[PDB]
Every structure is written in C-alpha cells, then in structure tokens.
Design an enzyme around this catalytic site. Structure first.
Site, mmCIF file in Angstrom:
data_model
loop_
_atom_site.group_PDB
_atom_site.id
_atom_site.type_symbol
_atom_site.label_atom_id
_atom_site.label_comp_id
_atom_site.label_asym_id
_atom_site.label_seq_id
_atom_site.Cartn_x
_atom_site.Cartn_y
_atom_site.Cartn_z
ATOM 1 N N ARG A 45 1.049 -0.733 -0.069
ATOM 2 C CA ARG A 45 -0.053 0.003 0.180
ATOM 3 C C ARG A 45 0.979 0.974 -0.138
ATOM 4 O O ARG A 45 0.426 2.572 -0.484
ATOM 5 C CB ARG A 45 -1.139 -0.367 1.405
ATOM 6 N N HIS A 49 0.487 4.332 -3.205
ATOM 7 C CA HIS A 49 0.577 5.774 -2.974
ATOM 8 C C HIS A 49 1.603 7.247 -2.824
ATOM 9 O O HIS A 49 1.130 7.449 -3.264
ATOM 10 C CB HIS A 49 -0.022 5.859 -1.082
ATOM 11 N N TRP A 188 -10.809 -8.801 3.796
ATOM 12 C CA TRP A 188 -10.634 -9.062 2.245
ATOM 13 C C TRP A 188 -11.675 -10.075 1.675
ATOM 14 O O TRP A 188 -11.666 -10.899 1.420
ATOM 15 C CB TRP A 188 -10.000 -8.859 1.371
HETATM 16 C C1 HEM Z 1 -9.896 2.757 -7.083
HETATM 17 C C2 HEM Z 1 -8.608 2.163 -5.357
HETATM 18 C C3 HEM Z 1 -8.342 1.962 -4.852
HETATM 19 C C4 HEM Z 1 -8.864 2.543 -3.506
HETATM 20 C C5 HEM Z 1 -10.284 3.657 -3.226
HETATM 21 C C6 HEM Z 1 -8.801 1.938 -2.570
HETATM 22 C C7 HEM Z 1 -8.594 1.766 -0.911
HETATM 23 C C8 HEM Z 1 -8.428 1.654 0.125
HETATM 24 C C9 HEM Z 1 -8.533 2.153 1.198
HETATM 25 C C10 HEM Z 1 -9.057 2.466 1.893
HETATM 26 C C11 HEM Z 1 -7.834 0.681 2.329
HETATM 27 C C12 HEM Z 1 -7.917 0.228 3.898
HETATM 28 C C13 HEM Z 1 -7.895 1.773 4.416
HETATM 29 C C14 HEM Z 1 -6.766 1.475 5.527
HETATM 30 O O1 HEM Z 1 -7.782 1.357 6.581
HETATM 31 O O2 HEM Z 1 -5.455 1.331 6.475
HETATM 32 C C15 HEM Z 1 -6.900 0.411 0.919
HETATM 33 C C16 HEM Z 1 -5.993 -0.936 1.672
HETATM 34 C C17 HEM Z 1 -4.966 -1.708 0.973
HETATM 35 N N1 HEM Z 1 -4.988 -1.020 -0.877
HETATM 36 FE FE1 HEM Z 1 -6.562 0.246 -1.096
HETATM 37 N N2 HEM Z 1 -7.566 1.473 -3.179
HETATM 38 C C18 HEM Z 1 -7.219 1.315 -3.988
HETATM 39 C C19 HEM Z 1 -6.279 0.732 -4.623
HETATM 40 C C20 HEM Z 1 -5.214 -0.406 -4.270
HETATM 41 C C21 HEM Z 1 -4.294 -0.493 -5.407
HETATM 42 C C22 HEM Z 1 -3.944 0.080 -7.230
HETATM 43 C C23 HEM Z 1 -2.771 -0.940 -4.765
HETATM 44 C C24 HEM Z 1 -2.269 -1.906 -4.858
HETATM 45 C C25 HEM Z 1 -1.718 -1.899 -6.161
HETATM 46 C C26 HEM Z 1 -3.477 -0.950 -3.835
HETATM 47 C C27 HEM Z 1 -3.578 -1.917 -2.116
HETATM 48 C C28 HEM Z 1 -3.676 -1.682 -0.688
HETATM 49 C C29 HEM Z 1 -3.414 -3.002 0.226
HETATM 50 C C30 HEM Z 1 -2.116 -4.027 0.013
HETATM 51 C C31 HEM Z 1 -4.451 -2.506 1.506
HETATM 52 C C32 HEM Z 1 -4.071 -3.174 2.525
HETATM 53 C C33 HEM Z 1 -3.700 -2.307 3.117
HETATM 54 C C34 HEM Z 1 -3.282 -2.686 5.251
HETATM 55 O O3 HEM Z 1 -3.240 -4.324 5.597
HETATM 56 O O4 HEM Z 1 -2.650 -2.957 6.264
HETATM 57 N N3 HEM Z 1 -5.144 -0.814 -3.227
HETATM 58 N N4 HEM Z 1 -7.424 0.176 -0.061
#
Ligand code: HEM
EC number: 1.11.1.5
Length: 291
Positions: A45, A49, A188
């Site tokens: 993540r 970002h 997830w």
């Molecule tokens: C329109 C696209 C996306 C949106 C709206 C989005 C939004 C989010 C949100 C709201 C979270 C959780 C944040 C938290 O509470 O800690 C999250 C987690 C995460 N995102 Fe996305 N995401 C998007 C795209 C992506 C992409 C393209 C990647 C990587 C190639 C990605 C990888 C991750 C990963 C690995 C997590 C988990 C992190 C953890 O376990 O703490 N996401 N995302």
C-alpha cells in the site's frame, strides 16, 4: 517537468539485492504486526500511494522524488496508517544511507509482493530525492465510496487502461481495512498475507450484502465475514471490468503476469530512463538465496 533516472553513485545490482534482503529478513522477523498479518500488505500500500499521486498532464507526483518524507504528503488523510510502513523501513535506510527514498519506498512494495509468494516484479533504480516544494498537494488519491465510472476516469490520469486497473485491484486480497485509518473495517478474505487471485473469486462467489458500518460508511459484507469497498465492488457492475475479473478468477497465472507489468508501470510513471541506464533488476527471494 522531466525527471531523469540517475543511478546512486557506484551502486550495482548486488548493492540493491542487499537492501531487498534486509527488508525481507525484517518482514520474516516482525511477523506479529496487525494480528499476525505482518508488514507485507502495508508495504505494498505504501509503494502504491507514493506512486498514485502522479499526474500525466504536467509530470508532477509519482515515485521519483520520494516526497512522502515531507510533512504535507506524510499527513495526507488518504495516507493514514502508512506511518507504520515508514517506521518499518527507517532502520533499513540508516543501514543503507546511499539509497534514495523513492527507490527504497518502491523497493519495499516489490520485496513484499515477492516474499508473500507473488510474481517477480522487475525493478529499476534511479529515483532522485527532490525538494519539499515538489511535494504534490493532498487529494490526488482515490475515493472508496464511488462507482466503475469514477474508477475508469481516475486511473486515466496515471494512464492505466481497463486490464491494468483490474490487475492492480487484485492487491486487495492483501491485508485489511482498519476503522481508525479509513472509516472501513474488516478483512478482504481468508488468505491475507499470501498473494493470490482471491479478490476475484470472492467478488464472483460471495453473497455480498450492503450495510452501514460503525463509521457510517457503506460497505459490502458477506456471510463469510469478509468485506468490500463500494469502489471495488463496482468492478462487477461494469461489463468491461467484469469480463476481466472472470478471467483472473479462472486463471491465477494470467493475473500474476498482468499484475507484474501493471505494478512496475505504476512505480515507473513519470521517470525517464536514459539508455545508458541498467536494465530492470530481478531480485532473488530469501528462499532462492538459502537465507
Ligand atoms: C480505486 C482504488 C483504490 C481504493 C479506493 C483503495 C482504498 C483502500 C482503502 C480504503 C484501504 C484500507 C486502509 C486502512 O484502513 O488501513 C485500502 C487498503 C489496501 N490497499 Fe487499496 N485502494 C485502491 C487501490 C489499491 C491498489 C491499486 C493497491 C495496490 C496495487 C492497493 C493496495 C492496498 C493494500 C495492500 C491494502 C491493505 C493494507 C493493510 O493491510 O493495511 N489498493 N485500500
């Protein structure tokens, strides 16, 4: 803006493989983080970002300048929770003081995916730390409460097409949402620190129900105790996105090849590589090295 990749002076492949090994050994070691999920998911993540801020129109943002190190970008509301991955990498940066920040933040995402049994991601060195006034303003990162039309349009700014958007979104089989970081809560799926095509199988096979959570945001919840963001459930409501989801749900190798290409493109957008520059590095995992 033009941002030319410049290799860290005097560094070759084996220098970078040592930085990879330090991250990978520390992932193995700090396995307790986030109820035994480990730091792998927050590290991919972080790499998405610092890369996701890019604007194709004026070449601003993206991974090149390592600007997440500055207060403005570090304190961006959309980056809440990423401080954990920063703090993880900080001892590794005192150990290898010659690596640039953008190179270290992007290498951490490459190392996490491959150590979580993902595909090999080719990586290029050469990002150069740029000053605090090159830092992008807040608000370039995507919203979670939107539809498939928002998704298509958002990713056009990073010029990602439909397949690349659906491949990149498969990273949401990793880790989980946290209420205090984003107003969303829950895993997830079931295998959250092993890179698999589980995102697509869940999207096509669970009985998803729309509910409000404790933060008053909507999310899709399934009988199995898993959740989905509205922006991510959108992929089954668009006919173009849905045919690619089904392709990856049936073929994990196709998903791995496409995710590899798309993630490298994402981490290299905005950077010009001279052809004197070294070819992309393919790092060995700890296991391949007997470490
Ligand atoms: C329109 C696209 C996306 C949106 C709206 C989005 C939004 C989010 C949100 C709201 C979270 C959780 C944040 C938290 O509470 O800690 C999250 C987690 C995460 N995102 Fe996305 N995401 C998007 C795209 C992506 C992409 C393209 C990647 C990587 C190639 C990605 C990888 C991750 C990963 C690995 C997590 C988990 C992190 C953890 O376990 O703490 N996401 N995302």
């Amino acid at each position: 803006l033009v941002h030319v990749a410049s290799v860290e002076k005097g560094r070759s492949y084996e220098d970078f493989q040592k930085v990879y090994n330090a991250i990978a050994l520390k992932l193995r070691e700090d396995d307790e983080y986030d109820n035994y999920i480990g730091y792998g998911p927050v590290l991919v993540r972080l790499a998405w970002h610092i890369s996701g801020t890019w604007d194709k129109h004026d070449n601003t943002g993206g991974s090149y300048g390592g600007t997440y190190r500055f207060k403005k970008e570090f304190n961006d509301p959309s980056n809440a929770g990423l401080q954990n991955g920063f703090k993880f990498l900080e001892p590794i940066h005192k150990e290898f003081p010659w690596i640039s920040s953008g190179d270290l933040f992007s290498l951490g995402g490459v190392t996490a995916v491959q150590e979580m049994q993902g595909p090999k991601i080719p990586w290029r060195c050469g990002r150069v730390d740029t000053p605090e006034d090159t830092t992008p303003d807040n608000g370039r990162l995507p919203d979670a409460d939107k539809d498939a039309g928002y998704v298509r349009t958002f990713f056009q700014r990073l010029n990602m097409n439909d397949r690349e958007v659906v491949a990149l979104m498969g990273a949401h089989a990793l880790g989980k949402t946290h209420l205090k970081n984003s107003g969303y809560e829950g895993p997830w799926g079931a295998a959250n620190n092993v890179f698999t095509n589980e995102f697509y199988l869940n999207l096509l096979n669970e009985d998803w129900k729309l509910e409000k959570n404790d933060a008053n945001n909507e999310q899709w919840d399934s009988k199995s105790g898993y959740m989905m963001l509205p922006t991510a459930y959108s992929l089954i409501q668009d006919p173009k996105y849905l045919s690619i989801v089904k392709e990856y749900a049936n073929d994990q190798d196709k998903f791995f090849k496409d995710f590899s290409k798309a993630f490298e493109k994402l981490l290299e957008n905005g950077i010009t590589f001279p052809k004197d520059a070294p070819s992309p590095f393919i790092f060995k995992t700890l296991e391949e090295q007997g470490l």
